[PDB]
Amino acid sequence: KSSSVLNMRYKNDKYVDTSGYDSNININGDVYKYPTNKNQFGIYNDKLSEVNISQNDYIIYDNKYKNFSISFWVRIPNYDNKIVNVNNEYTIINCMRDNNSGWKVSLNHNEIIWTLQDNAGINQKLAFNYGNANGISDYINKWIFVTITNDRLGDSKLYINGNLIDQKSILNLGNIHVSDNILFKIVNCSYTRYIGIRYFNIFDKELDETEIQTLYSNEPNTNILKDFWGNYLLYDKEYYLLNVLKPNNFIDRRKDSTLSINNIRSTILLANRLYSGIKVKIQRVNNSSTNDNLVRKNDQVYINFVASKTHLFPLYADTATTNKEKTIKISSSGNRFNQVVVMNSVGNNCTMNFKNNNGNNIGLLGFKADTVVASTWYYTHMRDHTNSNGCFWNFISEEHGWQEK
């Protein structure tokens, strides 16, 4: 009875429809499943790799006036920003009949396209070109939330990450009859590549901004922290650091054990290098075997500096000073100084609260001048100050989807 007429979710080694209308979902060939989140799947184009949804006859769109919405998340790697640099529209999600009636999700160079066509061949296209990274990109190789709403007596609207970016009237479109099958398949891409898809939903209404933003906020587990790419933040994984307020800077070590922030990132054309600076690893304080590798809100953790693959040193707050803010230091001895770190997040941004074992607050990880510090200032200036975002961090994993030499 819900607005959701199709929901593609994972259960026991395959994808099922959790809506209630019982559409069938089949996998053909080699479809990748994300271990940390099996709702996310990857499709290739260098072999057989597709997902086919056989829609229930009850939910197949064949009206002139019924509003409908589609939502999903897409992940699109560029690999080097070179192999992808080709102007050619290629399909990734097909719900169009033999007469090209229905709807289609296609991609191009740094571009997402939605097409809606009726039975008479009248169509409308909405698009979003996020372009090449200028500094830090919020889209490339990241999970992007796509939502398309369709009011048959008005506009078709395209939302990216909850924000409306394109709209065009579909008043001139008559009867739309979509395909019986929804095909997730990279078709007509001139290069070899893969694409990630997750949380595909079809709704039988026009979603408003509130509903879209709710989906955006809640579809990935808010309890679990995210990495730079938008996947789950993991324990015992090497990460580079990014400061949200200082995107053009990276963190480096000093000879005195302190961490510096006055290091400008190199660019590749206009795109800051991601794989620069120190690497860190998150470690559980209280570890069980029943516990997974996901980093959750309010987790007590240790943050370890990676001197080398097999040499980790605890990062701690040097309290032996007269300053309110305490510099973060690498402990060469391995001593943790009776300190712990509490993890939390706001959206995709992560916070790290350095505390004593006795529960005393030392401060959120941020910076002062040119040094990484722990400061209690942030506690009361999280939102509306110029310097608020100084306590927000992203964890960058070195991955095949983003390469730099």
Epitope: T321, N323, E325, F367, K368, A369, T371, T386, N387, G390
Partner: nanobody, 129 residues
């Protein structure tokens, strides 16, 4: 090209007035809070005054307030400290310093080197009869 050079310090009779000038290079005053910090004969550094220029805000060590006056001139890219009514205990080496505006805006009374992005060389200010 990042550099801070201070001039104007010397010997002036008690109750006098001096004008320290910190000429900076490599950055703009819109991106950096500016500060004057004094070091006594062997004592720890003592923060004297600071200025935010993007909004005129000034900050003075309680003793300093009213007597001294910090100013900036994106005009000539020069930081000024207009001294007046000098007292004997103001004798020290006076460094200018630049702090990244985007960092934690606390003001430590006895800062260390990591409290500021860039320091100067320091001009001596002696006050004796």
């Amino acid at each position: 090209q990042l550099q801070l050079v201070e001039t104007g310090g010397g010997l002036v009779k008690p109750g006098g007035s001096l004008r320290l000038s910190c000429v900076v290079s490599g950055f703009t005053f819109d991106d950096y809070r500016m500060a004057w910090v004094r070091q006594a004969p062997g004592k720890e550094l003592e923060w004297v005054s600071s200025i935010d220029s993007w909004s005129i805000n000034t900050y003075y060590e309680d003793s300093v307030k009213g007597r001294f006056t910090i100013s900036t001139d994106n005009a000539k890219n020069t930081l000024y400290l207009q001294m007046s009514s000098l007292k004997p205990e103001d004798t020290a080496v006076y460094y200018c310093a630049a702090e990244d505006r985007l960092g934690v805006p606390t003001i430590n009374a006895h800062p260390s080197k990591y409290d500021y992005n860039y320091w100067g060389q320091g001009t001596q200010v002696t006050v004796s009869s």
